[PDB]
Structures are given as structure tokens and as C-alpha cells.
Design brief:
Number of helices: 6
Largest sheet: none
Order of helices and strands: HHHHHH
Oligomer: monomer
Number of strands: 0
Shape: globular
Number of domains: 1
Helix content: over 70%
Distance between the termini: 13 Å
Radius of gyration: 13 Å
Length: 99
């Protein structure tokens, strides 16, 4: 889905991306950031791999946004942060095609 697309495109660290997820989850029953972090961390150690935990966290967060209906708001929020990090507009265009 667009959750996997957004998670693949973003280059933000979890330390920053968590802010957008936490901001856009207001009013929903989506998991908080510590709940996501604990769930993914356990899921990572029950099936250990070379997949960075940060990538699993971000993908879990994008999926959770899709489940509770704020993936579009999260994509806009993530793109705002990336543009603040001067992510090139040519690359923002690649994710803007979901809109």
C-alpha cells in the first residue's frame, strides 16, 4: 500500500519521524510512540535479521497511520520535515505522485 511506499521513500531518522506520527495520530486509537517502539523491538528480536530497526519502526508507523486513517496527513507532515532538511524537490516529486 501507500504505507510501504511512504516508508521506503522517507530518509528521516525515527527520532524525527516519531514527531510527525505522534502529531497526526490525535483523536485515533493508534499506538503511541513507546508502544510502537516496544512492539517493533520485540518483533525484531523474535525474528532477528540485518534489517535496521529504524526501518521497521518507520514501516510499522506508516502502516498504523493507514489502519487509523491518517496516512495522508502523515505523508504531508513527513514531506514538510524532509523539505526542511532540503530533500531535493525532484525526490519530493516521486512521493507527491501518491497525492
Amino acid at each position: 500500500s501507500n504505507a510501504e511506499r511512504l516508508a521506503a521513500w522517507t530518509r528521516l531518522p525515527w527520532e524525527g519521524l516519531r514527531y510527525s506520527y505522534n502529531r497526526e495520530r490525535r483523536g485515533t486509537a493508534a499506538r503511541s510512540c513507546p508502544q510502537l517502539e516496544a512492539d517493533v523491538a520485540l518483533k525484531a528480536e523474535t525474528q532477528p535479521s540485518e534489517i535496521p530497526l529504524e526501518r521497521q519502526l518507520i514501516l510499522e508507523a506508516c502502516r498504523e497511520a493507514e489502519r487509523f486513517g491518517f496516512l495522508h496527513e502523515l505523508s504531508i507532515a513527513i514531506v514538510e520535515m524532509e523539505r526542511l532538511n532540503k530533500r531535493p524537490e525532484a525526490e519530493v516529486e516521486e512521493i507527491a505522485k501518491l497525492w
